[PDB]
């Protein structure tokens, strides 16, 4: 645990399995302490900056609550202005921020941006999200998996990412398998697989640690034995709207529905999903896409799965805050 | 007072007259305590979310100061992003926020949004403003009226809303008359009256409580005997600009000016107005509208009334903060 | 020091040389105390408003950290909404804010706006930046100059502003020379000189205080003997892009480079610059301007000077926070 003090948190592969175990134990302690009304503040007098170049309105909440609970003050710097590196270089920005703040949370674009912030600020920099990795969500998922399979090592678990696994969360799961020996199934069309070189590197590491990484288009063999099925949205705003039709055509067979859950053969399989999810007609955008592409009842997951007892998405969402807090406490307090 | 603990505050009609009296007494105590330098913080360790879908830059101030004074921390989520229910359903948003925050203040659109937040968050949700009601402003006005008519019950007071009463504040005043027995005069062109069914319902209730609700186009009989004349702006950005000419033509006879104040026959009549007000040429928009529609000297209220000794608009504005604070304290602290 | 209590800070000329000396001593004490882990909070329970009509995303950081360190709470009101005086008059806004907040920091447009805020709010108002002055940056520069020339009075120092001195910082330096007896050199094309009347007024004052103000196009005589060379960007977004070519043509001879530094004849000359600076190709805008106008290697300052041992820009940037804090402490705490 002492190995975290004054260090950044830029991706999971910068840490050992034992360090990850200690971090998740801290998150679980902080969660229990707050639930029981006995949280001990370790960050009184610390000032934290949130550099959120990529942002939704709600994104800041888990980070602010984590800091506030621990006694720190927060300065939120959102995506309304220009990007970092537009008017001022990343190195210059890092040097200025590092004299003002005790810690910096980053959410944005290329991994090199957060590496430069970490190198030149002189204070812990925590990667919430980059193009390459989604460490904040990964930690939240890992804690949630432990809570719902108590007393199991990660190398005893099987996790499925269904749908479009070619993104920063797919990469973070590859890292998790590499480090912890997780049995990881990326169940996806071949065009939606993470890059082969990173897959090959993490697969060699995972093997050494008692795990395995499988990429397959076949849903029945892919999800068999799963303890958890994770998915996320199939289309994003920014990727051109005229590509949505072919992407949806490719991905709609990979919808997490009651059939896919039953194909695991595991009555205790649980469902995960980085929020927001398009699972019904109760959003303007979800209702439009359901009508335009024929997806009433839910897109990447059905309303039935999303609201089922197997769905643990709101525990997962809450656990973002507890694991963010563990990172801040472990790196800022001795 | 104990009846408020862990409850939402969604509209005045959810409360009894006695509960309202106790709430306003708490606001007056908190105001006195702060003025005398002896405020006791009841909200240390509480995290409050401000979900302000409809916002002006200044709107957050009264809510943040109220929370800060009481020791709470605040996360402001403004109207720059997408609306709630665009990308994530209201129910999903409520469930996530309710695990993070101890209380949620909402300012936005339909009343059903704030009802859903209240139902699914599991924490107190306070309605600052919806399409239907303006509870935060109503409480501020009621406290201000008590302060300027000490020792009078609301059923001993006469309040006039002059101008366009067809809006959320008109509805909140109908509720206030229904509940407290206020003598309420909506002095307005018939096209600018609140909906007849809500008027009829509140009129039956008001009668039972010793009050009365009058809707009239006649200014002389409408304002006679008034203790307070309230008004607000006649045109809003969003309503189409080409409708302004007919609206102003309809409403300009209802300007609160020295003549209307004298027609009350009450030398102690006071003037109220939810800020901002267009009362002179010292705003870019007010100066343009004054020139375009012939309203130099003030629109819905003249500069003379606005700056007169009868004007209590800045006491009213300050009392937003004290009454907001009373709602937060009454619902979050036992 | 007692003369600051409950006063605004609108421009340097509102203060005496002795008051400025005491303010900078307070800033140096607060800086030392924080570095040594023994800061004593003087602003617990104070609520401060940041009215930043002109804003970059990073601008709020120094003000928030200063307030947070001292125990105050902050409400940031940014430039995303409409300007003050668009929908509500400055006087009305000042009266409302002054009942809510203990102090108000302003960054924006005309000096009359901040004067009106100060006059009608009833609480200390601090001018961070207006069209006419840049007091926050001036105080940071003065502290930085003292730190790098310990035991020297300002009337023993020579400061150069190279480049376009016709702006709010040039005006603030004229005031500093007027008040402290600084030897101030504005080394600039004649079209980029501050207004003659303000120059003549401050020159009369500076003479009385043992200083001098020189405006010259001649770089060799202008910078000779300098203790410090300050500069800032040559072109701003808002000024029309088609004027950039002639402005750059006029200003590029005034680039702070190794040659200009050597022309001082002073091996210990230091370099200052209100950040951000365009000193290399590591910003999108800087790289485009370097390519379009032939300025690879740096615009108003070369990368070599900017990264040299003589460059003290990051000490200067940090000292914004310590001097802001001194203003808040001196005016809010007895």
UniProtKB/TrEMBL annotation, chains A, B, C:
<dbReference type="InterPro" id="IPR024904">
    <property type="entry name" value="OTCase_ArgI"/>
</dbReference>
<feature type="binding site">
    <location>
        <position position="168"/>
    </location>
    <ligand>
        <name>L-ornithine</name>
    </ligand>
</feature>
<feature type="binding site">
    <location>
        <position position="232"/>
    </location>
    <ligand>
        <name>L-ornithine</name>
    </ligand>
</feature>
<dbReference type="InterPro" id="IPR006132">
    <property type="entry name" value="Asp/Orn_carbamoyltranf_P-bd"/>
</dbReference>
<dbReference type="InterPro" id="IPR006130">
    <property type="entry name" value="Asp/Orn_carbamoylTrfase"/>
</dbReference>
<feature type="domain" description="Aspartate/ornithine carbamoyltransferase Asp/Orn-binding">
    <location>
        <begin position="156"/>
        <end position="330"/>
    </location>
</feature>
<dbReference type="GO" id="GO:0042450">
    <property type="term" value="P:L-arginine biosynthetic process via ornithine"/>
</dbReference>
<feature type="binding site">
    <location>
        <begin position="56"/>
        <end position="59"/>
    </location>
    <ligand>
        <name>carbamoyl phosphate</name>
    </ligand>
</feature>
<keyword id="KW-0963">Cytoplasm</keyword>
<dbReference type="Pfam" id="PF00185">
    <property type="entry name" value="OTCace"/>
</dbReference>
<dbReference type="GO" id="GO:0004585">
    <property type="term" value="F:ornithine carbamoyltransferase activity"/>
</dbReference>
<dbReference type="GO" id="GO:0016597">
    <property type="term" value="F:amino acid binding"/>
</dbReference>
<dbReference type="Pfam" id="PF02729">
    <property type="entry name" value="OTCace_N"/>
</dbReference>
<feature type="binding site">
    <location>
        <begin position="134"/>
        <end position="137"/>
    </location>
    <ligand>
        <name>carbamoyl phosphate</name>
    </ligand>
</feature>
<feature type="binding site">
    <location>
        <position position="107"/>
    </location>
    <ligand>
        <name>carbamoyl phosphate</name>
    </ligand>
</feature>
<feature type="binding site">
    <location>
        <position position="83"/>
    </location>
    <ligand>
        <name>carbamoyl phosphate</name>
    </ligand>
</feature>
<comment type="similarity">
    <text>Belongs to the aspartate/ornithine carbamoyltransferase superfamily. OTCase family.</text>
</comment>
<dbReference type="GO" id="GO:0019240">
    <property type="term" value="P:citrulline biosynthetic process"/>
</dbReference>
<dbReference type="InterPro" id="IPR036901">
    <property type="entry name" value="Asp/Orn_carbamoylTrfase_sf"/>
</dbReference>
<feature type="domain" description="Aspartate/ornithine carbamoyltransferase carbamoyl-P binding">
    <location>
        <begin position="8"/>
        <end position="147"/>
    </location>
</feature>
<keyword id="KW-0808">Transferase</keyword>
<dbReference type="GO" id="GO:0005737">
    <property type="term" value="C:cytoplasm"/>
</dbReference>
<dbReference type="InterPro" id="IPR002292">
    <property type="entry name" value="Orn/put_carbamltrans"/>
</dbReference>
<feature type="binding site">
    <location>
        <position position="320"/>
    </location>
    <ligand>
        <name>carbamoyl phosphate</name>
    </ligand>
</feature>
<protein>
    <recommendedName>
        <fullName>Ornithine carbamoyltransferase</fullName>
        <ecNumber>2.1.3.3</ecNumber>
    </recommendedName>
</protein>
<feature type="binding site">
    <location>
        <begin position="274"/>
        <end position="275"/>
    </location>
    <ligand>
        <name>carbamoyl phosphate</name>
    </ligand>
</feature>
<dbReference type="InterPro" id="IPR006131">
    <property type="entry name" value="Asp_carbamoyltransf_Asp/Orn-bd"/>
</dbReference>
<feature type="binding site">
    <location>
        <begin position="236"/>
        <end position="237"/>
    </location>
    <ligand>
        <name>L-ornithine</name>
    </ligand>
</feature>
């Amino acid at each position: 645990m002492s190995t975290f003090y004054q260090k950044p948190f830029l991706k999971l592969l910068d840490f050992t399995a034992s360090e990850l175990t200690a971090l998740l134990q801290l998150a679980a302690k902080l969660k229990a302490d707050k639930k029981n009304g006995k949280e001990e503040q370790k960050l009184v007098g610390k000032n934290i900056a949130l550099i959120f170049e990529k942002d939704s309105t709600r994104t800041r909440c888990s980070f602010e609550v984590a800091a506030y609970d621990q006694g720190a003050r927060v300065t939120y710097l959102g995506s309304s202005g220009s990007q970092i590196g537009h008017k001022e270089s990343i190195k210059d920005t890092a040097r200025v921020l590092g004299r003002m703040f005790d810690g910096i949370q980053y959410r944005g674009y290329g991994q090199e941006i957060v590496e430069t912030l970490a190198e030149y600020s002189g204070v812990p920099v925590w990667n919430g999200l980059t193009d390459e990795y989604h460490p904040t969500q990964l930690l939240a998922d890992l804690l949630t998996m432990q809570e719902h399979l108590p007393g199991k090592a990660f190398n005893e678990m099987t996790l499925v990412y269904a749908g479009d696994a070619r993104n920063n969360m797919g990469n973070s799961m590859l890292e998790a398998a590499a480090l912890t020996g997780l049995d990881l199934r990326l169940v996806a069309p071949k065009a939606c697989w993470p890059q082969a070189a990173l897959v090959a590197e993490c697969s060699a590491m995972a093997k050494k640690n008692g795990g395995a990484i499988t990429l397959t288009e076949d849903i029945a063999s892919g999800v068999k034995g799963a303890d958890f099925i994770y998915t996320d949205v199939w289309v994003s705003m920014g990727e051109p709207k005229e590509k949505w039709a072919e992407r949806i055509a490719l991905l709609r067979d990979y919808q997490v529905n009651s059939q896919m859950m039953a194909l695991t053969g595991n009555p205790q399989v649980k469902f995960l999903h980085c929020l927001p999810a398009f699972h019904d007609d109760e959003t303007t955008l979800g209702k439009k896409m359901a009508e335009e592409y024929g997806l009433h009842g839910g897109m990447e997951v059905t309303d039935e799965v999303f609201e089922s007892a197997a769905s643990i998405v709101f525990d997962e969402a809450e656990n973002r805050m507890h694991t963010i807090k563990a990172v801040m406490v472990a790196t800022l307090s001795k």
